[PDB]
Amino acid sequence: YSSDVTTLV
Amino acid sequence: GPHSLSYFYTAVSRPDRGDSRFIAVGYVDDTQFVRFDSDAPNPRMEPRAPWIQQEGQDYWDRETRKQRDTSQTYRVGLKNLRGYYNQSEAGSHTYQSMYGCYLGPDGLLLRGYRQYAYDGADYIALNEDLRSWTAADTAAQITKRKWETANVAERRRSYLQGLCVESLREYLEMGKDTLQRAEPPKTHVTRHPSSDLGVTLRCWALGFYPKEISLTWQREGQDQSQDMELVETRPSGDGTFQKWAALVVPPGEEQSYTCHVQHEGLQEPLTLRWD
Amino acid sequence: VARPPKVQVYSRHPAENGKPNYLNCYVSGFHPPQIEIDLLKNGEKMNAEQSDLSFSKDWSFYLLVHTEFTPNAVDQYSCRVKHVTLDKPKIVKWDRDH
């Protein structure tokens, strides 16, 4: 399962 | 040989088209098992190994949602990064991320990681403590401050220690017939012309899994990495791998050299030599 | 600095004339990811499958291009690669010794 945490650079 | 689950993300801006492309692949150990490509029409997370196909639509839907969000975040990110580095819109630039978990012998996280690159150079990375960031330049300190303000590291750590490890164990069960079986290399030595200085001996290792392997040449108990050509381990195309090592030797002296092959599918290293 | 591709052309199994096999062009170590990789039969492009773009720990990319083929004594095979780091297309010939 891939990470749900995705944050803009 | 601790098992791992890892994801590899690549985003590339395309100024000629005024857009960007995002590609994601997932691996268990050395076996690819999913992909996502923002350029596909109605893009979805897609299976790339047989054992993942048993996941139900809830899985593929939720993976697809996360990858669609990530694809959009990385497209917007490329514009931010172009600002940080004083770059024009004429060129293409590349933003990459990789992250994953290794499973320790007790079933706990042995090592987690999350790192990022811009135009092929380290940008920012999560430290070993999974609590802090290391930023590579002044542009990366902008991101670092934003991610500290938002407590991002704590969320990454929960993922790496929790869901990442848990899913890895599940995948390892699902594909245990292939992911948990080591295939030893089939090996042989060939001889070829080189030049005036001697003949080439080439030691082959074929069809092995997993990818890690050691090929070494020796003369009378002494290593020959000095003069040897060692190719990059390459895929066979069926999920196994190949590698060779070659060395120019004096004519008539072939039997003084032995090739030694260490692989986890072998009980002991193989020793072989030209017949 | 951009990194140029390392190119290997090889068969899945040791080649035997007249025996069905698989032809592989493995391209690795390169950056940026935009790249053109073609397998060639007697100079004509084969419609070979290309793997999903991935990369190594040092951030450099790798790709496998591959297709079925049956070697014989006549047909010549090669791999042709175009990349920003290459001022001329890089051509690597298939021989059964590598």
mmCIF file of N, CA and C in Angstrom, chain B residues 8-10 12 25 27 32 35 48 92 94 96-98 113 115-117 120 122 192 202 204 231-232 234-238 242 244, chain C residues 3 6 8 10-14 24 26 28-29 31-34 49 51-59 61-62 64 96-98:
data_model
loop_
_atom_site.group_PDB
_atom_site.id
_atom_site.type_symbol
_atom_site.label_atom_id
_atom_site.label_comp_id
_atom_site.label_asym_id
_atom_site.label_seq_id
_atom_site.Cartn_x
_atom_site.Cartn_y
_atom_site.Cartn_z
ATOM 1 N N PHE B 8 8.708 4.017 -6.081
ATOM 2 C CA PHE B 8 9.596 4.905 -6.826
ATOM 3 C C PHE B 8 8.734 5.826 -7.668
ATOM 4 N N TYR B 9 8.816 7.130 -7.406
ATOM 5 C CA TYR B 9 8.013 8.141 -8.088
ATOM 6 C C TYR B 9 8.892 9.042 -8.956
ATOM 7 N N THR B 10 8.434 9.313 -10.175
ATOM 8 C CA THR B 10 9.149 10.184 -11.096
ATOM 9 C C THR B 10 8.161 11.162 -11.701
ATOM 10 N N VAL B 12 8.104 14.565 -14.376
ATOM 11 C CA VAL B 12 8.893 15.293 -15.353
ATOM 12 C C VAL B 12 8.007 16.374 -15.943
ATOM 13 N N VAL B 25 6.081 3.293 -9.557
ATOM 14 C CA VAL B 25 6.176 1.837 -9.563
ATOM 15 C C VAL B 25 6.398 1.365 -8.138
ATOM 16 N N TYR B 27 7.642 -2.070 -5.743
ATOM 17 C CA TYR B 27 8.401 -3.308 -5.699
ATOM 18 C C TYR B 27 8.246 -3.992 -4.350
ATOM 19 N N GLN B 32 8.691 -6.159 -9.376
ATOM 20 C CA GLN B 32 7.718 -5.078 -9.532
ATOM 21 C C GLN B 32 6.318 -5.652 -9.429
ATOM 22 N N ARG B 35 1.985 -0.367 -10.974
ATOM 23 C CA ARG B 35 2.426 0.840 -11.662
ATOM 24 C C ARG B 35 1.261 1.818 -11.743
ATOM 25 N N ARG B 48 1.065 -5.458 -11.766
ATOM 26 C CA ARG B 48 2.182 -5.858 -12.605
ATOM 27 C C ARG B 48 2.797 -7.186 -12.176
ATOM 28 N N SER B 92 12.967 21.037 -19.474
ATOM 29 C CA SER B 92 12.333 19.994 -18.688
ATOM 30 C C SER B 92 13.164 19.714 -17.446
ATOM 31 N N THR B 94 13.116 17.288 -13.530
ATOM 32 C CA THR B 94 12.731 15.980 -13.003
ATOM 33 C C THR B 94 12.678 16.034 -11.481
ATOM 34 N N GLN B 96 11.984 13.463 -8.246
ATOM 35 C CA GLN B 96 11.857 12.048 -7.898
ATOM 36 C C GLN B 96 11.681 11.848 -6.398
ATOM 37 N N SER B 97 10.993 10.763 -6.040
ATOM 38 C CA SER B 97 10.921 10.348 -4.644
ATOM 39 C C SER B 97 11.017 8.835 -4.579
ATOM 40 N N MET B 98 11.665 8.335 -3.532
ATOM 41 C CA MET B 98 11.614 6.912 -3.233
ATOM 42 C C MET B 98 11.422 6.740 -1.738
ATOM 43 N N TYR B 113 12.719 4.528 4.940
ATOM 44 C CA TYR B 113 13.386 5.656 4.310
ATOM 45 C C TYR B 113 12.391 6.408 3.450
ATOM 46 N N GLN B 115 13.128 9.748 0.602
ATOM 47 C CA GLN B 115 14.025 10.775 0.114
ATOM 48 C C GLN B 115 13.541 11.296 -1.226
ATOM 49 N N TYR B 116 14.103 12.433 -1.604
ATOM 50 C CA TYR B 116 13.647 13.187 -2.763
ATOM 51 C C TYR B 116 14.861 13.707 -3.515
ATOM 52 N N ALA B 117 14.717 13.832 -4.834
ATOM 53 C CA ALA B 117 15.747 14.430 -5.665
ATOM 54 C C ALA B 117 15.126 15.417 -6.644
ATOM 55 N N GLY B 120 18.015 15.028 -10.477
ATOM 56 C CA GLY B 120 18.948 13.948 -10.248
ATOM 57 C C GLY B 120 19.884 14.141 -9.076
ATOM 58 N N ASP B 122 20.272 14.900 -4.820
ATOM 59 C CA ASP B 122 19.588 14.878 -3.530
ATOM 60 C C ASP B 122 18.997 16.245 -3.206
ATOM 61 N N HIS B 192 37.063 -16.278 -25.024
ATOM 62 C CA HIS B 192 36.917 -15.467 -26.219
ATOM 63 C C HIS B 192 38.238 -14.807 -26.550
ATOM 64 N N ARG B 202 35.109 -15.400 -19.395
ATOM 65 C CA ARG B 202 33.872 -14.744 -18.986
ATOM 66 C C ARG B 202 33.092 -15.727 -18.137
ATOM 67 N N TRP B 204 29.713 -16.549 -16.121
ATOM 68 C CA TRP B 204 28.315 -16.177 -16.280
ATOM 69 C C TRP B 204 27.512 -16.675 -15.089
ATOM 70 N N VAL B 231 29.714 -6.515 -15.433
ATOM 71 C CA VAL B 231 28.573 -5.781 -15.973
ATOM 72 C C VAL B 231 27.512 -5.597 -14.894
ATOM 73 N N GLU B 232 26.673 -4.593 -15.108
ATOM 74 C CA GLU B 232 25.535 -4.388 -14.234
ATOM 75 C C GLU B 232 24.603 -5.591 -14.292
ATOM 76 N N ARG B 234 21.467 -7.564 -14.781
ATOM 77 C CA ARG B 234 20.426 -7.207 -15.730
ATOM 78 C C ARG B 234 19.272 -8.195 -15.662
ATOM 79 N N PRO B 235 18.054 -7.751 -15.978
ATOM 80 C CA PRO B 235 16.900 -8.651 -15.903
ATOM 81 C C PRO B 235 16.875 -9.620 -17.074
ATOM 82 N N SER B 236 16.515 -10.872 -16.775
ATOM 83 C CA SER B 236 16.306 -11.874 -17.820
ATOM 84 C C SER B 236 15.045 -11.590 -18.618
ATOM 85 N N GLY B 237 14.080 -10.891 -18.015
ATOM 86 C CA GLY B 237 12.784 -10.672 -18.616
ATOM 87 C C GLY B 237 11.676 -11.516 -18.025
ATOM 88 N N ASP B 238 12.019 -12.557 -17.269
ATOM 89 C CA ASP B 238 11.043 -13.425 -16.622
ATOM 90 C C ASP B 238 11.029 -13.247 -15.108
ATOM 91 N N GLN B 242 20.598 -11.745 -14.558
ATOM 92 C CA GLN B 242 21.838 -12.235 -15.148
ATOM 93 C C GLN B 242 23.000 -11.316 -14.784
ATOM 94 N N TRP B 244 27.620 -11.117 -15.556
ATOM 95 C CA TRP B 244 28.884 -11.777 -15.875
ATOM 96 C C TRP B 244 30.076 -10.927 -15.467
ATOM 97 N N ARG C 3 23.669 12.115 -17.011
ATOM 98 C CA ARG C 3 24.419 10.883 -16.972
ATOM 99 C C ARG C 3 24.066 10.032 -18.176
ATOM 100 N N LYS C 6 24.222 3.317 -19.967
ATOM 101 C CA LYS C 6 24.928 2.065 -20.208
ATOM 102 C C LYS C 6 23.966 1.075 -20.857
ATOM 103 N N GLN C 8 23.157 -2.756 -22.603
ATOM 104 C CA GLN C 8 23.478 -4.165 -22.802
ATOM 105 C C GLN C 8 22.422 -4.829 -23.680
ATOM 106 N N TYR C 10 21.282 -8.635 -25.140
ATOM 107 C CA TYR C 10 21.526 -10.017 -24.748
ATOM 108 C C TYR C 10 20.230 -10.817 -24.868
ATOM 109 N N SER C 11 20.362 -12.138 -24.874
ATOM 110 C CA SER C 11 19.190 -12.994 -24.954
ATOM 111 C C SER C 11 18.844 -13.545 -23.575
ATOM 112 N N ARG C 12 17.558 -13.827 -23.367
ATOM 113 C CA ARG C 12 17.139 -14.407 -22.094
ATOM 114 C C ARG C 12 17.833 -15.744 -21.846
ATOM 115 N N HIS C 13 17.893 -16.599 -22.866
ATOM 116 C CA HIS C 13 18.587 -17.874 -22.761
ATOM 117 C C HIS C 13 19.749 -17.918 -23.738
ATOM 118 N N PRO C 14 20.782 -18.711 -23.451
ATOM 119 C CA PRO C 14 21.850 -18.908 -24.437
ATOM 120 C C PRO C 14 21.263 -19.242 -25.800
ATOM 121 N N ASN C 24 16.731 -8.889 -25.412
ATOM 122 C CA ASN C 24 16.660 -7.842 -24.395
ATOM 123 C C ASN C 24 17.642 -6.712 -24.687
ATOM 124 N N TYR C 26 18.822 -3.734 -22.261
ATOM 125 C CA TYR C 26 18.747 -3.171 -20.919
ATOM 126 C C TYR C 26 19.563 -1.886 -20.890
ATOM 127 N N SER C 28 20.579 1.466 -18.592
ATOM 128 C CA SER C 28 20.588 1.869 -17.185
ATOM 129 C C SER C 28 21.580 3.004 -16.949
ATOM 130 N N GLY C 29 21.483 3.622 -15.767
ATOM 131 C CA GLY C 29 22.438 4.630 -15.342
ATOM 132 C C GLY C 29 22.238 6.015 -15.913
ATOM 133 N N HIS C 31 20.251 9.799 -16.942
ATOM 134 C CA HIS C 31 19.536 10.930 -16.388
ATOM 135 C C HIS C 31 19.796 12.117 -17.309
ATOM 136 N N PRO C 32 18.760 12.850 -17.762
ATOM 137 C CA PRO C 32 17.319 12.764 -17.461
ATOM 138 C C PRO C 32 16.593 11.540 -18.070
ATOM 139 N N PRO C 33 15.310 11.340 -17.730
ATOM 140 C CA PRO C 33 14.624 10.098 -18.145
ATOM 141 C C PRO C 33 14.170 10.041 -19.592
ATOM 142 N N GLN C 34 14.053 11.170 -20.292
ATOM 143 C CA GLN C 34 13.639 11.135 -21.696
ATOM 144 C C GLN C 34 14.669 10.380 -22.521
ATOM 145 N N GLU C 49 8.358 -4.485 -26.517
ATOM 146 C CA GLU C 49 7.746 -3.960 -25.296
ATOM 147 C C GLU C 49 8.776 -3.228 -24.440
ATOM 148 N N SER C 51 9.602 -1.629 -20.506
ATOM 149 C CA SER C 51 9.225 -1.714 -19.099
ATOM 150 C C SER C 51 8.812 -0.349 -18.546
ATOM 151 N N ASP C 52 8.262 -0.376 -17.328
ATOM 152 C CA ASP C 52 7.864 0.848 -16.639
ATOM 153 C C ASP C 52 9.095 1.570 -16.107
ATOM 154 N N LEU C 53 9.131 2.883 -16.301
ATOM 155 C CA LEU C 53 10.267 3.688 -15.852
ATOM 156 C C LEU C 53 10.474 3.577 -14.348
ATOM 157 N N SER C 54 11.677 3.158 -13.946
ATOM 158 C CA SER C 54 12.062 3.084 -12.546
ATOM 159 C C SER C 54 13.482 3.618 -12.423
ATOM 160 N N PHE C 55 14.001 3.643 -11.204
ATOM 161 C CA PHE C 55 15.347 4.171 -11.025
ATOM 162 C C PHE C 55 16.015 3.502 -9.832
ATOM 163 N N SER C 56 17.335 3.712 -9.734
ATOM 164 C CA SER C 56 18.197 3.115 -8.727
ATOM 165 C C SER C 56 18.409 4.067 -7.553
ATOM 166 N N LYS C 57 19.146 3.571 -6.555
ATOM 167 C CA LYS C 57 19.413 4.344 -5.340
ATOM 168 C C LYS C 57 20.160 5.644 -5.630
ATOM 169 N N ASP C 58 20.956 5.691 -6.697
ATOM 170 C CA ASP C 58 21.659 6.914 -7.064
ATOM 171 C C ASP C 58 20.826 7.823 -7.965
ATOM 172 N N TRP C 59 19.531 7.527 -8.112
ATOM 173 C CA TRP C 59 18.510 8.283 -8.838
ATOM 174 C C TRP C 59 18.561 8.062 -10.346
ATOM 175 N N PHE C 61 18.033 6.224 -13.979
ATOM 176 C CA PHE C 61 16.906 5.441 -14.479
ATOM 177 C C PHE C 61 17.350 4.156 -15.162
ATOM 178 N N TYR C 62 16.424 3.199 -15.235
ATOM 179 C CA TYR C 62 16.672 2.016 -16.030
ATOM 180 C C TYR C 62 15.396 1.584 -16.722
ATOM 181 N N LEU C 64 14.006 -1.721 -19.593
ATOM 182 C CA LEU C 64 14.214 -2.934 -20.372
ATOM 183 C C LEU C 64 13.284 -2.891 -21.574
ATOM 184 N N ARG C 96 26.349 -13.319 -29.295
ATOM 185 C CA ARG C 96 26.001 -14.282 -28.263
ATOM 186 C C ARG C 96 27.099 -14.461 -27.232
ATOM 187 N N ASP C 97 28.119 -13.611 -27.250
ATOM 188 C CA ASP C 97 29.206 -13.703 -26.290
ATOM 189 C C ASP C 97 29.069 -12.727 -25.129
ATOM 190 N N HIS C 98 28.052 -11.861 -25.143
ATOM 191 C CA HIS C 98 27.886 -10.837 -24.116
ATOM 192 C C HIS C 98 26.463 -10.806 -23.545
#
